[PDB]
Amino acid sequence: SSQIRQNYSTEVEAAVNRLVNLYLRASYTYLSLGFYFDRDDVALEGVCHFFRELAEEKREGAERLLKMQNQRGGRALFQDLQKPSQDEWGTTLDAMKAAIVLEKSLNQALLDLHALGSAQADPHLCDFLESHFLDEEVKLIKKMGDHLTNIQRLVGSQAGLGEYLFERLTLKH
Amino acid sequence: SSQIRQNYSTEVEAAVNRLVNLYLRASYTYLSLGFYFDRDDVALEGVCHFFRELAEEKREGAERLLKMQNQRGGRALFQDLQKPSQDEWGTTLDAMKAAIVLEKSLNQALLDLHALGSAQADPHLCDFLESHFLDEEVKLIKKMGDHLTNIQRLVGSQAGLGEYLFERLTLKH
Amino acid sequence: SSQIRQNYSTEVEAAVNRLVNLYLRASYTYLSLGFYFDRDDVALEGVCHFFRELAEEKREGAERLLKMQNQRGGRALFQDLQKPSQDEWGTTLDAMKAAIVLEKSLNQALLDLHALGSAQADPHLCDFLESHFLDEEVKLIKKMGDHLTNIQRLVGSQAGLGEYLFERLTLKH
Amino acid sequence: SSQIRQNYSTEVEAAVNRLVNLYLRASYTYLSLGFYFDRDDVALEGVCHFFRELAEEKREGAERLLKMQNQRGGRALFQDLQKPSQDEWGTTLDAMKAAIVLEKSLNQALLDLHALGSAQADPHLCDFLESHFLDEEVKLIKKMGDHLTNIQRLVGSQAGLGEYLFERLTLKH
Numbered sequence A, B, C, D: 001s002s003q004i005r006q007n008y009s010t011e012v013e014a015a016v017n018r019l020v021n022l023y024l025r026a027s028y029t030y031l032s033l034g035f036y037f038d039r040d041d042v043a044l045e046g047v048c049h050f051f052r053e054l055a056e057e058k059r060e061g062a063e064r065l066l067k068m069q070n071q072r073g074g075r076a077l078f079q080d081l082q083k084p085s086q087d088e089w090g091t092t093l094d095a096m097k098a099a100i101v102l103e104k105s106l107n108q109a110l111l112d113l114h115a116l117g118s119a120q121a122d123p124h125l126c127d128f129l130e131s132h133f134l135d136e137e138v139k140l141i142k143k144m145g146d147h148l149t150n151i152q153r154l155v156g157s158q159a160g161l162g163e164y165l166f167e168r169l170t171l172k173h
């Protein structure tokens, strides 16, 4: 094994790699969500970047996990990326729910890995997640919640008009 | 014939001139569309420039075709410009459909001329269309598609209110 | 089908999607190659970015293909991404060969798609590849060839010392 | 005892002081390593600063521990500093191994102190180590690993020439 490796469990090594996959899968889902909203028959530019900036961020989470894996003396193993769960994503509201659900899944994987870190007494891993992931994921889920409430409130009245306003007035383009 | 002319078919020369007419007719349609939306009883400033910047662009396509005709040793022949197909253009939605249809017609004329170029083995003509027209026309038709989807979605709910918002929030003024 | 779609074959639509997969797979291979060279027991910073800037570029090819798919009125379908072909990538020389091979495969897929475009008489697609992919891929394969020759020449003499010099003096960090 | 002291165990107080000694001993080792490489018969300027900037950093760790000790209401007790383990440090490779070993020892002392913090329920101490030491030590050990791999690879071929290149091309001066 590695010349540098110290207090780094094979369990955590393996779980970090699983987390890289989850983050890359999420990035790929957000690409699919992104380009869906760029379809001529959907055409909500604002929604399209929202999900495309999110694709960038999850790819950055996975790249951060990989950097760390190497820093600890673990060995990145890449697995197949399954495709996003859907080919069409519905309304902005349908999409934003799916994202929340996606993000809650990533968050739980994060919490599952803290718990493993604590069980393994790996304080660098705990710190790593606390500094770079836990806080950013809580903030993101909140913002998605906030979007969900606004979209729900708008599209309850007039669906399509509600969709347009939200994209125009909340989301950037 | 011309001192410069080389690999330039009479077929393509003639088809280039037909294309100039089509581009000038389109420019004239976009002028009519433009000033229609500046009527006091229509008054959608945003829609008015959208079509007026498009009148400029098609006049620029025809001027570009004419420059090229001369560059190849062809001889520009101008024909009568028939007037736009309508005197009143309806709603923003009616207007934007007509534009798509107009632009699809121009696009097909472009594709018809590539095919002629290939048949004639005129690689400068093919290149000319690829560099200055094909890509710009695809991008434009997409944007019109995108506008159509947004207008449809808005005016399905509340027609007039939908028209106002689109003009205010999507189109520039 | 789409309101914008014009001269866009289902064959090309499908082949564009296959090309997105190939570009995403390549991006994923270059991530694996990248982080391999960041291992403490490999530690060639220069090689690591070379492959990481390449991961970025192929993700940009796939994003460009997706933008276009939408511009034409096609519908992006995403498939599973198979994992990179190897878990360990050997020497810089082993790695750089694999990249050439990867890039030649992408290039052939590109050439296969031009040919399809020509068969379908889709001049926007041909242009699209010519402008954004064909030239960039030829330039890249050349540079990889150039690296291969330099690495071969260095490591023939002294392997490890040759590897260090190449990374230090040719590649950036 | 102190007017400020709160949730601060005598165990941790004592262990913090032991950690100050370890950091000062390390600083002193890096001074000895530093000036060894400045000998006229060794003369690797690059290696000399590498170890001298490290002497500064460990003195900064100990000063940071002392500031904290005071912040918590502990009382710094200083003990004798034993001299570095060697008078001559061999090659760059011999030196860089010794450093890794030194740094791994400091790292384990850090991990031993987190564990004590957790046992004592001292969350400020845990945080303190996580924020200022754990991450910096992991990053440093990685870089030493990376240097070790490069030095090994160079000096396997030609020892002295390998030493010169590494100092010239990796290390700063």
Ligand SMILES: [Au+]
Binding pocket: A117, A118, A121, A122, A123, A124, A125, A126, A127
């Ligand atoms: Au922990």
Ligand SMILES: [Au+]
Binding pocket: A114, A115, A117, A118, A125, A126, A127, A129, A130
């Ligand atoms: Au944790």
Ligand SMILES: [Au+]
Binding pocket: B117, B118, B121, B122, B123, B124, B125, B126, B127
């Ligand atoms: Au041609």
Ligand SMILES: [Au+]
Binding pocket: B114, B115, B117, B118, B125, B126, B127, B129, B130, C123
């Ligand atoms: Au053509």
Ligand SMILES: [Au+]
Binding pocket: C117, C118, C121, C122, C123, C124, C125, C126, C127
């Ligand atoms: Au073609």
Ligand SMILES: [Au+]
Binding pocket: C114, C115, C117, C118, C125, C126, C127, C129, C130
């Ligand atoms: Au082609």
Ligand SMILES: [Au+]
Binding pocket: D117, D118, D121, D122, D123, D124, D125, D126, D127
């Ligand atoms: Au604690």
Ligand SMILES: [Au+]
Binding pocket: A123, D114, D115, D117, D118, D125, D126, D127, D129, D130
């Ligand atoms: Au801790």
Ligand SMILES: [Cl-]
Binding pocket: A123, A126, A127
């Ligand atoms: Cl923790």
Ligand SMILES: [Cl-]
Binding pocket: B123, B126, B127
């Ligand atoms: Cl051509």
Ligand SMILES: [Cl-]
Binding pocket: C123, C126, C127
């Ligand atoms: Cl072509």
Ligand SMILES: [Cl-]
Binding pocket: D123, D126, D127
């Ligand atoms: Cl903690």
